[PDB]
Amino acid sequence: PHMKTTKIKFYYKDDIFALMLKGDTTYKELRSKIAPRIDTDNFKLQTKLFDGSGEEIKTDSQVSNIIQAKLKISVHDI
Amino acid sequence: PLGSILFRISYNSEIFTLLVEKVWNFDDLIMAINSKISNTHISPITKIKYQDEDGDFVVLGSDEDWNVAKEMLAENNEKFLNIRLY
């Protein structure tokens, strides 16, 4: 072992990014991760599924779950 | 030869492979990429996309992601990379 993390992706407008969140990552954490990927500091994240209109990761219980559940995410400008 | 990563890069409707040791950061590999992708005749580029296990294509150009790339690979230790440009 050395640093256990999750492999979760995200979608911004028409681009997809990939980030690593440990088994205790918080939303803000998850969000801070997508920011440096996007071109904005005002972006939202949401679990992307068959529909593409899942839940918006704003709370730790989700973002985390996304790292655990390995849930796909979609980030967008706000 | 050694434990390096081959950057399978598909720019437009063609494929280019750029080797990048796992010991280097987003630069060298980019420095490597630019060394192989520039042949596309468009621009030296500054960002790359990489196919994830999800079956889609994502981006990569940060220390955080860079670690994900090596690790995402580590899991399978393929020693390659499915990259795409444009």
UniProtKB/Swiss-Prot annotation, chain A:
Signal peptide: none annotated. It is found in: Cytoplasm, Cytoskeleton. Residues 5-78 form the PB1 domain. It comes from the Eukaryota. Interacts with AXL2 and BUD5. Necessary for cell polarization during vegetative growth. May link the cytoskeleton to morphogenic determinants on the cell surface. Present with 6490 molecules/cell in log phase SD medium. This is Bud emergence protein 1. The lineage of its organism: Eukaryota, Fungi, Dikarya, Ascomycota, Saccharomycotina. The chain holds residues 477 to 551 of 551 of the full protein.
UniProtKB/Swiss-Prot annotation, chain B:
Residues 4-86 form the PB1 domain. Coiled coil: none annotated. Signal peptide: none annotated. It comes from the Eukaryota. Promotes the exchange of CDC42-bound GDP by GTP. Controls the polarity of calmodulin, and the calcium regulatory process of bud emergence. CDC24 may be involved in the initial selection and organization of the budding site. Interacts with AXL2. Present with 1010 molecules/cell in log phase SD medium. This is Cell division control protein 24. It comes from Saccharomyces cerevisiae (strain ATCC 204508 / S288c) (Baker's yeast). The lineage of its organism: Eukaryota, Fungi, Dikarya, Ascomycota, Saccharomycotina.
